[PDB]
Amino acid sequence: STGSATTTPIDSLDDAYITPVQIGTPAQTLNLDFDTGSSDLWVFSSETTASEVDGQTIYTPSKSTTAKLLSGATWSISYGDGSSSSGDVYTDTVSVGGLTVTGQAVESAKKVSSSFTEDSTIDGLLGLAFSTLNTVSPTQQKTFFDNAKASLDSPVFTADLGYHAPGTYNFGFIDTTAYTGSITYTAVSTKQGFWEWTSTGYAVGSGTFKSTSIDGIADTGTTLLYLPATVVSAYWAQVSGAKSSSSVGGYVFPCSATLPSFTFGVGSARIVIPGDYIDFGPISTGSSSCFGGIQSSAGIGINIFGDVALKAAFVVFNGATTPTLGFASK
Numbered sequence: 001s002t003g004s005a006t007t008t009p010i011d012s013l014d015d016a017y018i019t020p021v022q023i024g025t026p027a028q029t030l031n032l033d034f035d036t037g038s039s040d041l042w043v044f045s046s047e048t049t050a051s052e053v054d055g056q057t058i059y060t061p062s063k064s065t066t067a068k069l070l071s072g073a074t075w076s077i078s079y080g081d082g083s084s085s086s087g088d089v090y091t092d093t094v095s096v097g098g099l100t101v102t103g104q105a106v107e108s109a110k111k112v113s114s115s116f117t118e119d120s121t122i123d124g125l126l127g128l129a130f131s132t133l134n135t136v137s138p139t140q141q142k143t144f145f146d147n148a149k150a151s152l153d154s155p156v157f158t159a160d161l162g163y164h165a166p167g168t169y170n171f172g173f174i175d176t177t178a179y180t181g182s183i184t185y186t187a188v189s190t191k192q193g194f195w196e197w198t199s200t201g202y203a204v205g206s207g208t209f210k211s212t213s214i215d216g217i218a219d220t221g222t223t224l225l226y227l228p229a230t231v232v233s234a235y236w237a238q239v240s241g242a243k244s245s246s247s248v249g250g251y252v253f254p255c256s257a258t259l260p261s262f263t264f265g266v267g268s269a270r271i272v273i274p275g276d277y278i279d280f281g282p283i284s285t286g287s288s289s290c291f292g293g294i295q296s297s298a299g300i301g302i303n304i305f306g307d308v309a310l311k312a313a314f315v316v317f318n319g320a321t322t323p324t325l326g327f328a329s330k
Contacts, residue, residue, distance in 0.1 A: 001151045002172035003099025007034065007161065010121040013280055014307060015223050017161060018121060019169055022095040023106060024064030030057050030123035034169055035221030036159070036195055036317065037304070039133035039143050040077050041094070042085055042107035043124035044116075052112050055120030059108065066102075067092045075107045075135045080222070080300065085112040089136055094144060096126075099171050101148050105134075105141035125221065128157065128317065133193035145171070145319060155319045159220055160330070161311035163277055179314035179328035184269035188323040192302075194219070195317060197325050199305075200267060202227075204235050205260030209270070216303030218310060218317070218325055224280070225262075225273070226297035226304040235262055235294050242292070248283050251292040255282060262294060264309060266327040273312040 007019040018031040023043070030043055044056040061067035067090045076086035087110035094104040109124070116122070127134070131142045149155045152172035160178050161167040168178070189196045194217040203209040214227065232251065236242040238260050242253035253259070259275030278293035293308040316326030 001099055001148070002153055002170070003095075003097035003148075004168060004170045005097030006166050007169055008166045009162070009164065010119070012164070014161075014164060014311065016119075016122065017167070017220070017307070018123075019096070019126070021126060023059055024061070024092050025066040026064075027095070028057075028059055028064065030059060031121065032124050032126040033122050033221060034126050034128055034159075035219070036128045037217060037219035037221045038077065038079065038125065039127040039129045039131055039193065040075060040107050040135055041105065041124070041126045041144055042075065042077070042087070042109055044112070045087070045108040047087060048109045049111055052117045054117050057123045059106065059124075061090045061092065061106075061108065064092055067106075070105065070136075070139075073105075073136050073139060073141075075137070077135045080304075081115070083113045083115040085109045085116060087111065089141070096144065096171065097169070099148060099152075101144055104144055104147055105136060107136065128220070129195065130190050130193045132190070145317075148172075149319060157317050157319070159310060159315045159317065161220070161307055163274075163311050167311070174316060179330045181329055183314070183316060183326040183328040184266045185316070185318070185324045185326045186266050188325050190323060194302075195323070195325055200265030202231055202265065203263040203270075204238050205262075205275075207238075209263065209265070211265075214264075214303055216297075216305050218315060219304050219306050220310060222304045222306030223308070224304075224306050225294045225308040226300055226306065227294065228303065229296045229298045232294055232296045235260070236292065244296075248289070248291065250295045252283060252289045253292055255288045255290040257290075264305075269327065271309070271313045271327055271329060273309060277308055277312060
């Protein structure tokens, strides 16, 4: 089997991407944030505290003939940005882009934090990291990808995110028309439950490439590119007027600037992030200070190749017995 679904930016800045997902019978279509940095499939639901729902589409398990309470199971998750959610669990049929999993754990939110409530376009998350991170207790549950794997033509999924445009998540096949040149594969460590890999270095603009190992995670659920302070300082030093602002919470730059590209290494290959991908616009409406798309990972504890980086590539998440990651230009 295979699946193919379009993923669409939620706003003009590509702050996140939503992908339609069919849950239950008859289908209830919710727009979920596919997140390769977590491993829970959770949704706004008929059980979500009413004051914490503001415009989201909800899953109502009582209206699904295939929903079953997973008795005794609860979940609770906290994300890197300090957001959180929790609730109980149903199993139901879940389909993404024509690919159907029966008996998928669908985690129903009873509570969500304010950032989720305020995001009217995101109806929940679909985790695509390794199932060892799944938060369901007392019986940990598998991700959609792990449940689908056996049925897939090939045990892979791919992320092809657009810059200010829709893109695609495919399951079970590699679309050889979706990228240019070759795919370069690189080793993955699953020790922390993430798609963790080591970049071979970076360049700023037309500068020379610096060979240096940068361990980090491929995370579709993180907006920006978070890298070591040394790397990030070298980047922003090439933008006149750029500075790190503790009041704003990161590097800002004059909106009048033209940003240089940023290149990262994947083995001997190179992925180029155009300067425009690094512009996240005015810090507040009408401001001439703009927020940068490359930020320091210092104090996160991990480097994160988020959407800024991933959208510059066609990315293969290879879930074979020994997982790997592949990157191609596009």
